[PDB]
From Swiss-Prot, chains A, B, C:
The lineage of its organism: Viruses, Viruses incertae sedis, Naldaviricetes, Lefavirales, Baculoviridae. This is Telokin-like protein 20. It comes from the Viruses. The chain holds residues 7 to 108 of 180 of the full protein. The gene is TLP20. Disulfide bonds: none annotated. Shares some antigenic similarities to the smooth muscle protein telokin, but is not similar at the sequence level. Signal peptide: none annotated.
Length: 102, 102, 102
């Protein structure tokens, strides 16, 4: 049972309608085939933005990310990562972004 | 080959721009790891709303749900569930929602 | 390690706000259970449209498709296919579409 990948949401520096999701700790996993990895998104007030408008998930690499809003409250997010290659994520690396269409 | 999870779409009571997806029958599945489960969405006229505007999928628990519109017609929907924990879904339970951005 | 499914984006004939994704080569794969298949989307200028507005992924069959925008540049797209049944994709067949909400 692989450990969860931890990210923290931050407002993008350039575009206020983009949330950056940063890797909290190094995560390296040399895997084989397309795997599913649970991503743990820390609750933060910035997340509320995702509950106000449509959005598009942006991948920062060779993998796909599935995001879902949560029924309860506006400060959480569910996310699963589908890796294509081997997992070599550095701390502080950007995993993904969500672009909000206002 | 696991049996499909069956849901029925209903208009949310509070927000007319939200479709609730209710579990038709009890589904319990004590699984290990992230699994993919096909969700069977019954055709219903209410689904048409998903073909008129953008939308966001809301998860009602510890799992992620992937929805796709279907090429043919406005009364269907494709959905796959990615469970994070063991599956303990009660009949009449809400699996997920789709929030439509008008 | 299954080979990637190759698609090419084209503007839909009827609706200029729809991108069609056509199968480049025949891909048949009699599989068992829900599998994940990496889809290889050729870079094309038409893709830029996905980076300008919200969109909805439309599935052309019995499978689900996960799309993600890419951090770098407006001419690429990430996509993973989750097959429900056995894979019998013909060359020139439409795999999926993306409907852009302007």
């Amino acid at each position: 049972g692989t450990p969860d990948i931890i990210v923290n949401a931050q407002i993008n520096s350039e575009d206020e309608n983009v949330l950056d999701f940063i890797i909290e700790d190094e995560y390296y996993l040399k895997k084989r085939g397309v795997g599913a990895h649970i991503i743990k998104v820390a609750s933060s007030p910035q997340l509320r933005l995702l509950y106000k408008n449509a959005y598009s998930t942006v991948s920062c690499g060779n993998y796909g990310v599935l995001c879902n809003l949560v029924q309860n409250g506006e400060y959480d997010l569910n996310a699963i990562m589908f890796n294509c290659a081997e997992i070599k994520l550095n701390k502080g690396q950007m995993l993904f972004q969500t672009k909000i269409w206002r």
